[PDB]
Structures are given as C-alpha cells and as structure tokens.
Amino acid sequence: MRILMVGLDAAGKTTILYKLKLGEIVTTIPTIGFNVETVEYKNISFTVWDVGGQDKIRPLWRHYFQNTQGLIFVVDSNDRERVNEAREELMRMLAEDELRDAVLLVFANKQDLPNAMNAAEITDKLGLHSLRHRNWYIQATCATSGDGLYEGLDWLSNQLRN
Amino acid sequence: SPAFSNDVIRKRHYRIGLNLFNKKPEKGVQYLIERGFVPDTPVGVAHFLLQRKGLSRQMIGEFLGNRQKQFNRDVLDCVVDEMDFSTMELDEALRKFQAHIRVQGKAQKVERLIEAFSQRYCICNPGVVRQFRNPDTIFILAFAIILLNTDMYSPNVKPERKMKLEDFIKNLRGVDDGEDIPREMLMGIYERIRKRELKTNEDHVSQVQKVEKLIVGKLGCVLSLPHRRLVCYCRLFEVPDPNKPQKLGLHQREIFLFNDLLVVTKIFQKKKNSVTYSFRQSFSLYGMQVLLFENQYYPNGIRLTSSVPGADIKVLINFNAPNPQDRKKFTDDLRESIAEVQEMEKHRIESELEKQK
Ligand SMILES: Nc1nc2c(ncn2[C@@H]2O[C@H](COP(=O)(O)OP(=O)(O)O)[C@@H](OP(=O)(O)O)[C@H]2O)c(=O)[nH]1
C-alpha cells in the first residue's frame, strides 16, 4: 500500500516513520535521499514516503501521486503560529486530482506538550469538517512515546485492506 | 598545546571531541574549537570536516544542513566552495558532493544541502544555466536525480514502476518555467544513475556495519551508532574458573572492542570466504577495570571487573590470551578505551551541572 506522509517541517514525520519502522529489521544502510520505509501492520504492508520537498520541488512526487492510496498528514499540535500554514499545505495537496481517491489520516502530534491543541481543536483549525467525498480520521498522538500511532494504523489498514 | 609530538591525554581529548560530534555536531564542534583542535573560522571547520577521519558522514550532513545556524550556513558555503564542479554534468557534480557527506534523511536537511550545492554548480557552470528559462531548474533537476537514485535503488520501491528512461523524462515535463529540459540531457542523467548508484564514501561506521552483519544473535543490539568506532578484534579463551584448569583451545571467544563497548562471541561457520559470529555477551566500558593475572593454570590471564558506587567490585568475565603479546595489546587498547569512556561521562555530568543554573 503506497502511503504519502506529509506536513510542515518539525511536525514529527521522520520521528513517526522511525518509531513505526523500529520493530522491523534494518540489516542495511538506506539508499541516498528522502525517507522511505515499508511497515507491516495487521498483515498489510505499507510503503510510507516521508516527504517535504518545499513547493519548488512540489511538481515532482506527481509520478507516485497517481498510485498513492493513503495520506498521513502530521501536524505539530503545539505550533499555533503555523497551524494556518499547515491547513494551506493540506488543502494544496487535497486539491490534486491524482489524490482524489486517497484516504486521509491526520496525526495531531505532540500531545505530550501542555499547550498542545486537542484533536477537536485541530479539526476546526484545518477545516476537516468541510471535506465531503473523503475518508478521513484524526488521531491525537505523541510520536516520542508512540501513543496513538497504532490506533491511526488500525483506521488506515481498515480503509485499505488489499 | 600537546606533549611529546603526540600525547596520550591530548589524543584522548581529540577522540572525545570526535565522539561528541558524532552524538551532537554543534556540541562536538564547539568542544574541538575550545580545545584548540579546530580553528574558529567557517573555512577551518569546513576543511576539518572534509579532511579529518573519525567523523560520521551522516552527522557531517546533519551539521551542514542546519539551515537555522548562521555558523553552519557559512561552513556549508565554504565546504561547497572547496569543490570543483566546472565542466561536469549535474549527476557527476552531485556524485562528487554526495560522496563527502551523507545526503540522506529529513527533506529539510537534504534541501539545504543541495540548495547550497545547486548555487555552486550554477556558479561553476554559467553556460549551462543560460540554456534554462529559470535558474531554479538546476535545483529541481538535482532533486529529480536524488529522487531517481532512491526510486531505482531503494528495495522498498520493488520493480513495481521503478522508473524507466521515459518515466523519468515525462515526470520532468514543464519544469523549466513551463518548458522542458533537453530530452538527451535527461536521458544521460538517467543512464548515468542506472549504471552507478550514488553511494557516500566509506566511514568509520562502515566498518561497524560490516562487523554487525556477521553477528547472529539478540545483531548485538544495533551496534552501528554514529559515535561507535571499532577499536579491535582479538581471539581470547574464556575462563569460567581461574582457580581450576582447562583444555587449551577451550571456550574460544572472539572479542570486538568498540570505543564504548566490548562484545564477546563464539564463532558460527568460518566457512571459506566469510566468517559469522554467534554473540555471547556485551559489556559497557563505564565503571569497568582490567587486570592481568598469572597462575599455575593460566599464563596470559585477564579479568574484567566492574566497580559500581556502593555494590563495589563484580567479576564480569575472565580470559586467557594465547600469548603475552596479545594480552598486552588487548589490555592496552581496552584500558585506553575505558579512560576515553570515563572522561566522556565525567564531561556530560559537568555539562549538565552547568545546564542546571
Ligand atoms: N515532545 C515531542 N516532540 C516530538 C514529537 N514528535 C516529534 N517531536 C519532535 O519534533 C522535532 C522534529 O520532528 P521530526 O520527526 O524530525 O520531523 P519532520 O516532520 O521535520 O520530518 C524533533 O525535535 P528536536 O529536533 O528538538 O529533538 C522531535 O523530537 C512528539 O510527539 N512530542
């Protein structure tokens, strides 16, 4: 299953990728470039692409985009200053025709921080309630502790069962 | 600053700086500058990273890609200015650049390196940049090359739709301010990557990874950390009871000494072309001591003991070396490693006692 993991820098994407992969054998040095790992969950294998290529290199990824089945959008729930920018980046992605059928999992990350906005608050800030023809789920997480990650994967595996 | 040519303590301090860098690059650099091992200019630090062995190339990339630190940005610019990109095609230039640093990981890190690289390539090749309706086309193409390298060579992609020379060409349509980059240029770039992968030069950690894969049991708890260097390999015979005798070749262990750890293994296959290790136990060096012993049964004996505060003295393991020479060699290396580990922890407790203020 092809998964694209996006969100602003410092949201926790790379932390999530390695936390998720941690349980599977790393016998070799990963190839030069961005992060990509295959994660097996409830007998379903997900190839997760951890991306962030500005907007200058945004036209690329479009090759993959056609075959992307799921999107993981990671948000730093403590970063109020950049929440609108996160919304913009999400909506810019969702506008792509190539992703019209992709399912959306939102990780409202950094819930361990005392001033973190709740999943309900993030839902409002990202305008998720306005989306119609889309399968979406928001999951409160703390990537450092692993809390909420497998609950997110439960929803995503159920959406994609291939 | 050092003693007779090169001093045990100064060499230990230099190695401590490198150990600190490989854990935290900003902290390692500061330490080296303060201890007069590196001059304070961005050019000096750039040279140091480029030349001086013992630095993790992933960590060199982590430091150089820092985008927020003004010092790091200047270090990167000096680093890139030392490179000769004139008359090279983009892939050839990138091969050269990516050999000195590991251009892998976080998108923002990869972007910062690569943006610095692209600026330099364009300066060295102004006739190429004129062909383009947009200068950012070199930056975009640099990432298309990086992305191709990942697509072709990452096993997580699998020959699903691993890019053909046609998929690579079409993916880049319209990149040059609405127009295309030359078909033949893209074909060339593609065929060059297909013929040879972008790899990064052999690191001090390359050797640790080589060892780690030969070990079969519990790999030995991911020993290939950036800071970890392999001091030496040595065969020694394990002595369960120094008070009782034993057969000569009995309990043949294979020791691997890393700057912070001692790994012990029984062998597995030996085979012909390659040897594989079993993994018996792992010993942290902190708080450990080494002592030589000779009795009626063991001539070149060694006893490793750990002295923890309160529970004081524990006999971890006992060994017999095949010759006095090997005993001396191993003991000297292990003793130096312990002292290196001692001052490292001595430092981080002091560094933390200052943080609390
Ligand atoms: N407290 C907390 N921190 C988190 C959590 N998830 C990620 N982080 C932090 O977020 C920072 C950047 O995250 P990362 O996974 O590198 O991100 P990316 O989206 O930039 O690829 C890191 O901070 P540093 O670089 O300062 O270590 C990491 O420790 C979380 O749930 N809680």
Domain range summary for chain B, segments of one domain joined by + = 4-84, 85-202, 203-357
* Ramachandran angles phi, psi of B117, nearest 5°: -65, -50
| A9 assigned binding-site residue | yes
Burial A64-96 (b: 16+ CB within 10 A, else e): bbeebbbbbbbbbbbbeebbeebbebbeebbee
> What CATH fold (topology level) applies to the domain B203-357?
PH-domain like (2.30.29)
Can you tell me the distance from the alpha carbon of B214 to that of B211, in angstroms, rounded to the nearest whole number? 5
Contacts for B67 with CB less than 8 Å, ≥ 6 apart: B73, B108, B112
Are B156 and A47 an interchain contact pair (Cβ–Cβ within 8 Å)?
Answer: yes
Residue whose structure tokens are 């390298």 = B149
Residue A41 CB-density burial (10 A; 0-12 exposed, 13-18 middle, 19+ buried): middle
* Ramachandran angles phi, psi of B204, nearest 5°: -70, -25
* Ordered strands of the B288-293 beta sheet: B281-284, B261-265, B252-258, B230-238, B315-320, B301-306, B288-293
Q: Which two tokens stand for residue B300?
A: 């070149």
Q: Cβ(A110) to ligand 1 under 6 A?
A: yes
Q: What is the DSSP string of B210-268?
A: HHHTTB-----S----TT--EEEEEEEEE-S-TTS---TTTTEEEEEEESSEEEEE-B-
- Label the pairing between strands B281-284 and A70-76: unpaired
Can you tell me the distance from the alpha carbon of B287 to that of B289, in angstroms, rounded to the nearest whole number? 7
Give the nearest partner residue to B107 out of A34, A59, A63, using CB atoms: A34
User: Structurally, how many domains does chain A consist of?
Assistant: 1
Give the nearest partner residue to B110 out of A28, A34, A56, using CB atoms: A34
Q: What's the CATH code of the domain at A34?
A: 3.40.50.300
User: Which residues of A, range 61-80, sit inside 8 Å of B by Cβ?
Assistant: 62-63, 67
Domain hosting residue A128, numbered range? 1-162
- Label the pairing between strands A2-6 and A70-76: parallel
Atom of ligand 1 nearest to the CA of A111: 31
Told to judge if A54 belongs to the known catalytic residues of this protein, a careful annotator would answer yes
The CA–CA distances, whole Å, from A71 to A10, A125, A140 equal 18, 18, 16
* Ramachandran angles phi, psi of A74, nearest 5°: -95, 125
Q: Give the helix ranges, DSSP H, for A66-146.
A: 83-94, 119-126
Q: Cβ(B106) to ligand 1 under 6 A?
A: yes
Q: Is A154 helix (H, G, I), strand (E, B) or coil?
A: helix
Q: Cβ(A78) to ligand 1 under 6 A?
A: no
How far is ligand 1, taken at its centre, from the CA of residue A5, in Å?
14
**What is the DSSP-derived secondary structure letter of residue A147?**
B
Q: What is the resolution of this structure in A?
A: 3.3
* Ramachandran angles phi, psi of A62, nearest 5°: -55, -25
Give the nearest partner residue to B143 out of A27, A31, A60, using CB atoms: A60
Residue B217's CB is within 10 A of a number of other CB atoms, namely 12
Q: Which residues of B touch A37 (CB under 8 A)?
A: 156
The superfamily CATH assigns to domain B85-202 is Arf Nucleotide-binding Site Opener,domain 2 (1.10.1000.11)
Q: Is B41 helix (H, G, I), strand (E, B) or coil?
A: coil
A36 touches chain B (CB under 8 A): yes
- Label the pairing between strands B104-105 and A33-40: parallel
| A141 assigned binding-site residue | no
- Label the pairing between strands A70-76 and A103-109: parallel
**What is the DSSP-derived secondary structure letter of residue B314?**
-
| CATH architecture of residue range(s) B4-84 | Orthogonal Bundle (1.10)
Q: Cβ(A17) to ligand 1 under 6 A?
A: no
Provide the β-strand partners of residue A137.
Answer: A105
Longest dimension (CA), chain B: 86
Can you tell me the distance from the alpha carbon of A43 to that of A45, in angstroms, rounded to the nearest whole number? 7
Residue B257 contacts residue B17 (beta carbons within 8 Å): no
Nearest to B261 by CA among B296, B293, B231, B289: B231
Identify the helix (H) or strand (E) that includes residue A109: strand A103-109
Nearest to A48 by CA among A157, A141, A158: A157
Provide the β-strand partners of residue A106.
Answer: A73, A138
Ligand 1: residue whose CA is nearest its atom 26: A10
How far is ligand 1, taken at its centre, from the CA of residue B3, in Å?
44
Q: By what method was this entry solved?
A: X-ray
* Ordered strands of the A70-76 beta sheet: A136-140, A103-109, A70-76, A2-6, A45-50, A33-40, B104-105
Contacts for A105 with CB less than 8 Å, ≥ 6 apart: A70, A71, A72, A73, A136, A137, A139, A152, A155, A156
Q: Is A53 helix (H, G, I), strand (E, B) or coil?
A: coil
Residue A48's CB is within 10 A of a number of other CB atoms, namely 23
Q: Cβ(B105) to ligand 1 under 6 A?
A: no
- Identity of residue B147: L
Q: Is B109 helix (H, G, I), strand (E, B) or coil?
A: helix
Rounded to 5 degrees, what angle do the CA atoms A131, A136, A142 make? 125
Q: What is the DSSP string of B149-217?
A: HHHHH-TTT-SSS---TTHHHHHTTTTBTTBPPPHHHHHHHHHHHHHS-------HHHHHHHHHTTB--
